[PDB]
Amino acid sequence: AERVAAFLKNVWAKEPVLVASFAIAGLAVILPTLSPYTKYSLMINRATPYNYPVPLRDDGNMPDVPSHPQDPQGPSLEWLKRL
Template sequence: MAPLRNIAAFLKNAWAKEPVIVTSFAIGIGALLLPWVSPVAHYQTKMNRAVPLQYPVPLRDDNNMPDIPSHPCEKIGPSLEWMKRL
């Protein structure tokens, strides 16, 4: 309990002397913590993983390339099906 009282006393004293600085620190700490607790960050991470960084160059298919998908979306990996179910 003593450390909490010390922190509370420090914040009360700092707020009394420099409220602008305390407010700016609070906004900065909030800006650092918000992406970690926001549900939007979770879905944004899922979307970023589903979108490829480099799009494949189209190839002319001569029906002799079984390992190359005919469409870029036929690749193996994460999909955006979860987004359609929202």
């Protein structure tokens, strides 16, 4: 509208500190939901190994579990090297 724009003019003239404060806070609450790289923050936190990775007893039918760390199977960190 134009009533809305006039109001934004009056505060920007009288209370620039508060206008900046509400603008910065608004970005803080909105941008994370819109950012495409937010998903990588979760992935990186899950790629950090704080605990020993306890091995599994090989019953004989876990095709997707590697037998050696350098085998192809298992989660890769290729995306992280490029990121």
